[PDB]
Amino acid sequence: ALISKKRKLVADGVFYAELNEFFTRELAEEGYSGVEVRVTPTKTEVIIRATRTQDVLGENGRRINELTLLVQKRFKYAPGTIVLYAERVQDRGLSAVAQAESMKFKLLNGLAIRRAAYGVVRYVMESGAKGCEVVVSGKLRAARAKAMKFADGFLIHSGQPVNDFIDTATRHVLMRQGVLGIKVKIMRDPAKSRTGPKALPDAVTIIEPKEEEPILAPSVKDY
């Protein structure tokens, strides 16, 4: 035991990183996204936020059983001291990473190039996003590299609201001839922000006065 506070919090962050990697590698065909550690007394609560939990889970509870074991044996927990859980994510349409691996799996399933992104854009927008972007930067069919911007709606690109509102995802899709880059951008409608700032700092709304009937010489009422 017995650690620096400094050393620890960093150490935790690396733990996160490795953990998120391993799942991102392991649960692609299940639409993996994110983790959250939730440490407790007596337990450690890894929560897998994929889309197709039935696959994450496995026959009356296998695979997550395998995956636990895995995560377990490596980082050296003590059977029971760590626990796993599948959690289908509220609308995949607003997770960059969700729609990245979508298009990976679009192109990779022999799909037109624009049909991929123009689909992904359409679904993402239709899912209630306020803005979306798809770069495809790479090499297809012909020898030279190209790129392609696919976008619709509204995005902002600078300063803090970026951190707050736009999700970014790059993914390397390894095809026959070379690889290409998928790059996904979703901008979430700041209106619905829930926890956080609920607009653009840009936003300056005026409250709308009132028609008033003036006149009427004095007079007072009693009570």
Partner: protein, 67 residues
């Protein structure tokens, strides 16, 4: 340079367009006004706005202003 961005000047225009009774040549009250009367996301931007509606106020007092 201290040239005020449009969103500053734009908003000021709107505010004077519909709340001239209420408002004054006093920045400080014009500022407290701006809170109860509009949704601005930051102190800093709000003052930037309030000071300018305050500006256009003192100007109107000595002759109408376009816009």
């Amino acid at each position: 340079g201290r040239v005020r961005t449009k969103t500053v000047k734009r908003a000021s225009k709107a505010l004077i367009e519909r709340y001239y009774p209420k408002l004054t040549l006093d920045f400080q009250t014009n500022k407290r006004l701006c809170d109860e009367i509009a949704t601005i996301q930051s102190k800093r931007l709000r003052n930037k706005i309030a000071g300018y509606t305050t500006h256009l106020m003192k100007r109107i007092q000595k002759g109408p202003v376009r816009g």
